[PDB]
Design a protein around this ligand. Structure first.
Ligand code: CL
Ligand code: NA
Length: 129
């Protein structure tokens, strides 16, 4: 599913991401934009042979089982394919573990490089939330 900006903001607020660990809704939408272009089906292979999955490009090296990343953890205890669903529940719950693990939203390179220190509130401007 390819979300609208405001549709995704609204889906994310309902799943408890608005200000989760001090990160305003704008941050999560900005990261989804540059990670996946708001496409739940987004996949990308890493140089190490791990794969990034879904709206927030969650990595098979640490977070999900794709059965092809040797010596990887499944710290969200899910198949990576659950992260590609039009239901973002599995992606949101897993992102809550990731942003709690000590590095906050710096775990997402696109956030660090494209969202951090920008006006992120711009990403939810005009949305009915
Ligand atoms: Cl933090
Ligand atoms: Na894994």
């Amino acid at each position: 599913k390819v979300f609208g900006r405001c549709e995704l903001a609204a889906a994310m607020k309902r799943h408890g991401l608005d200000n989760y660990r001090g990160y305003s809704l704008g941050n999560w939408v900005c990261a989804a934009k540059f990670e996946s272009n708001f496409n739940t089906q987004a996949t990308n292979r890493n140089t190490d042979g791990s794969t990034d999955y879904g709206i927030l490009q969650i990595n098979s090296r640490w977070w999900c089982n794709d059965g092809r990343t040797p010596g990887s953890r499944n710290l969200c205890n899910i198949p990576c394919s659950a992260l590609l669903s039009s239901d973002i529940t599995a992606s949101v719950n897993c992102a809550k573990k990731i942003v709690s693990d000590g590095n906050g939203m710096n775990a997402w390179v696109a956030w660090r490089n494209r969202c951090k220190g920008t006006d992120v509130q711009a990403w939810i401007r005009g949305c009915r939330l």
